[PDB]
Amino acid sequence: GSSGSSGSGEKPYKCVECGKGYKRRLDLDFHQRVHTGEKLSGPSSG
Ligand SMILES: [Zn+2]
Incomplete structure (x- = not known):
């Protein structure tokens, strides 16, 4: 299925890029x- 995380609590402000x-x-x-x-980031794994 394509269920989602049941978010609780409504916020006045919401991002436009992601929608937070x-x-x-x-x-x-x-x-x-x-x-x-x-x-x-910077240093390459090793
Ligand atoms: Zn965002």
């Missing part, structure tokens, strides 16, 4: 960052 939901905008505003771009 944050109680406080500030929180989301910082989330969108992941959609814009973020450099974390």
